[PDB]
C-alpha cells in the first residue's frame, strides 16, 4: 500500500545517497552547506545555535549513516516498519 | 540527479500516504518521538517536546509544497 511505497521509496534514495558519499566528492559538503543556510528559518537567535550544532555534528552523522544500512536509516527516521 | 528525483518520488508517495492513509502522519510523529530516547536522559524529553512543537507546522508545510520545493529545501534537489 502507500505506507508500503513510502518505504520502498525510502530505500532507493537512501541507497542512491551512499553512493552519492561515496563517487561524489563535493556531495557532502554541498548538502551541510545547504542545511547550515536553512537555519536562517528558525529565528535571529536561533539560526547562530542551529549553524554551530550542524558544524559541530556534520562529519560523525554522515559517518554513522554511512555504517548503517539504507533500511535502518529509513525505519529510523519513521518511513519503514 | 538520482538522489534529487528519489526524493520526489519519496515526497510525492509520502503526500499520497497523508491523504489516503489516516494513520500515517500520527504513527510517524509517534515514531520520531520514539527515537529521541536514543539521545539519552536530559536530552531525550527536550527533543519529544521540539517534536510536539513543531510536528504540526512541518505536516502543513510538507502537505502545501510541491515534491520538489520539500527536496530542494532538504537539499537532495537543486
Ligand atoms: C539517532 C542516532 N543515530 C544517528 C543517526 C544513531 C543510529 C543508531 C541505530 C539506530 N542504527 C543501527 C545501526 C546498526 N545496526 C542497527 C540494527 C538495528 Cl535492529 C537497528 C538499528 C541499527
Redesign the pocket.
Known amino acids: 500500500g502507500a505506507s508500503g511505497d513510502v518505504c520502498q521509496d525510502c530505500i532507493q534514495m537512501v541507497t542512491d545517497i551512499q553512493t552519492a558519499v561515496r563517487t561524489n566528492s563535493t556531495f557532502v559538503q554541498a548538502l551541510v552547506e545547504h542545511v547550515k543556510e536553512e537555519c536562517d528559518r528558525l529565528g535571529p537567535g536561533m539560526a547562530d545555535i542551529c549553524k554551530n550544532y550542524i558544524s559541530q555534528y556534520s562529519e560523525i552523522?554522515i559517518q554513522?549513516?554511512m555504517?548503517?544500512?539504507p533500511k535502518?536509516?529509513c525505519?529510523?527516521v519513521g518511513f519503514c516498519d
Request: hydrophobic content about 70%; proline content about 0%; charged content about 10%.
Open positions: 552523522a554513522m549513516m555504517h548503517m544500512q535502518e536509516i525505519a529510523l
